[PDB]
């Protein structure tokens, strides 16, 4: 039974890319419009880093102790390798998207049930010639919506 509060092994872990027009965050749970990418070999999602700004002051009572805060957080880079599939429309659209090069939204789903949506642009398309596989990585732009926001 797919539900949170218990760990999941992560077998399915499907990946979809948006094709239509509208708000991706309006309802990510419906796959009416998004296209699935088939037989991914592996996937490393992006990590939401931050950046530290200095805060230490002269007249502050506590000296000899550095002080700093956070600001201007940025999303990470997603990477995934699939089987090189020049027939299916998935990677055809992926490569056309890269060649034309615009920001697009995509999503990852868990056996858990919860859904994650990112948006960004692709910056690499690799290849291997031993069990042919295609590796592609994208960089995110703007605010992503994690699954925890949806869970509320």
């Amino acid at each position: 039974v797919p539900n949170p509060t218990m760990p999941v092994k992560g077998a399915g872990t499907t990946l979809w890319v948006y094709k239509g027009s509208g708000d991706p965050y309006a309802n990510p749970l419906s796959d009416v419009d998004w296209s699935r990418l088939a037989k991914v070999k592996d996937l490393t999602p992006g990590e939401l880093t931050a950046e530290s700004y200095d805060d230490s002051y002269l007249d502050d009572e506590d000296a000899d102790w550095t002080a700093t805060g956070q600001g201007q957080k940025s999303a990470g880079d997603t990477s995934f390798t699939l089987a090189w599939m020049p027939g299916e429309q998935g990677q055809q659209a992926l490569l056309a998207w890269f060649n034309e090069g615009d920001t697009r939204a995509y999503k990852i789903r868990f056996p858990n049930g919860t859904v994650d949506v990112f948006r960004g642009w692709v910056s690499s398309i690799g290849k291997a010639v031993t069990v042919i596989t295609r590796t592609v990585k994208v960089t995110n732009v703007g605010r992503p919506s994690m699954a925890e926001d949806r869970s509320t």
Binding site: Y57, L58, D59
Partner: protein
């Protein structure tokens, strides 16, 4: 008479050039005098950094005083409650927080 309670970031610079009446001999013995009573008047270079939402307030304060009105200010840890006026300030509005660089010149009453 207002005051200045905003915090000052590390690296604020202090300069001091006392006024003397140099007059030279052939070699050495150059006579010197202390000039006026208040010879040296320290000059401070103060850097601040505030989140954008606050910045306008500080600006208005520096607008209210202009470059002709004095205000009390306490240098960090320094034993003196000096009176200082400012006539040069700039800021860098980057994305979230803006940093100001200003000069503060000491003046007697």
């Amino acid at each position: 008479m207002k005051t200045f309670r905003w915090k000052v970031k590390p690296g604020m610079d202090v300069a001091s050039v006392p006024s003397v009446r140099k007059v030279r001999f052939g070699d050495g013995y150059s006579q010197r005098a202390p000039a006026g009573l208040n010879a040296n008047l320290k000059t401070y270079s103060v850097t601040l950094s505030v989140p954008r939402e606050e910045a306008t307030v500080l600006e208005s304060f520096l607008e209210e005083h202009g470059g002709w009105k004095s205000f009390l200010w306490t240098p960090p840890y320094e034993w003196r409650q000096i009176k200082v006026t400012c006539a040069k300030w700039s800021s860098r509005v980057s994305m979230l927080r803006v940093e100001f660089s200003a000069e503060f010149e000491q003046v007697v009453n």
